[PDB]
Ligand SMILES: OC[C@H]1O[C@H](O)[C@H](O)[C@@H](O)[C@@H]1O
């Protein structure tokens with residue numbers, strides 16, 4: 389019965405309508421975000437603020453710079469990346485180019501063991517890399533892209549406030565991250581490095597986009613996690629001395645909602661994802677968006693649909709009932725389907741399911757709902773930052789460039805398009821250019837290191 393397939397699809401639509409956010413909902417989220425951002429910048433409310441607005445000590449005038457060979461480290465995902473990057477004088481300023489690169493999978497027992505284990509592993513990887521390229525012992529300036537909330541005292545010194553994205557290594561929170569890295573390198577003792585700069589991935593991304601676009605003063609990550617940085621007026625950065633020029637601020641907007649600010653928008657699936665995560669009650673805005681959580685959100689929606697007898701004859705496979713089994717890349721692949729249902733079919737088949745045609749269509753709709761809410765929620769955050777910037781500055785029309793990295797933004801067929809449209813609706817009187825970084829974290833880390841060096 390085509391009539392009863394259609395009836396199944398109308399029921400699915402009623403359940404899926406819960407993910408809708410209206411323009412006014414997004415404006416409410418945006419205003420709330422802006423409020424928390426104000427609170428994060430002020431000495432009086434900083435400690436209470438869920439959105440920390442952390443000074444990076446990356447400034448508008450980095451005085452000068454330096455050229456030569458730079459090593460970049462990137463820790464923040466399931467993979468740890470080492471690369472050699474060359475920084476050199478161009479016609480606009482410094483260019484940077486990725487030349488030798490290697491990536492290492494972090495063992496499970498290193499991300500959730502002790503900080504000694506984690507940083508020992510990192511030091512081992514740095515040795516392996518320097519071996520493969522004979523650039524060993526030698527001393528090189530090292531830039532560390534370290535994609536977790538850090539309270540900086542300077543560019544080369546900052547403490548880990550808390551792990552995010554499933555990181556749980558004991559003995560790291562409250563300690564100087566550069567210190568933890570130097571200590572581990574010294575314990576191995578088979579090379580020496582000049583640790584010159586530590587930066588957030590958002591910041592690395594913004595920096596890497598400058599040489600090509602000097603209007604880039606926002607960096608955004610929509611990958612495993614979700615965060616943004618931007619160039620704030622020094623007069624508004626109350627935690628740092630001085631009123632002149634600008635400093636990059638790491639919003640850590642992922643923790644937005646951790647004081648209840650998103651409560652009316654959270655769905656059962658969100659509560660379930662939060663509760664089975666490594667950091668329950670934390671990073672709640674990020675959990676609506678980030679790749680670490682998106683596929684899992686879809687899996688939970690599909691389980692609700694099977695339990696309602698609307699999908700897969702009401703039976704869920706072992707794989708479908710396995711945590712993390714619906715990968716976030718499957719969300720993108722499903723929404724890449726050209727209409728013949730082939731891509732969707734093959735995903736669900738490899739998950740042990742026997743999908744029908746309408747099963748495939750419902751799974752598409754489930755993915756679209758989760759990823760569209762992610763796009764819309766993210767848009768409210770970026771719009772809040774950009775509207776903030778426009779007001780802080782002297783601008784009837786603000787023209788700004790946003791530098792972006794992360795697999796969700798880059799590889800999802802329609803996230804990007806839905807995101808841009810929503811951001812534009814919320815930012816009248818702004819002309820926003822989006823740029824995707826190419827090796828943003830590696831080249832960014834090198835460029836900041838060149839300045840600090
Ligand atoms: O990797 C993207 C983001 O993931 C997380 O939210 C971290 O807290 C943040 O530092 C980072 O920028």
Ligand SMILES: [K+]
Pocket residue numbers: 622623624625626627628629630631
């Ligand atoms: K200040």
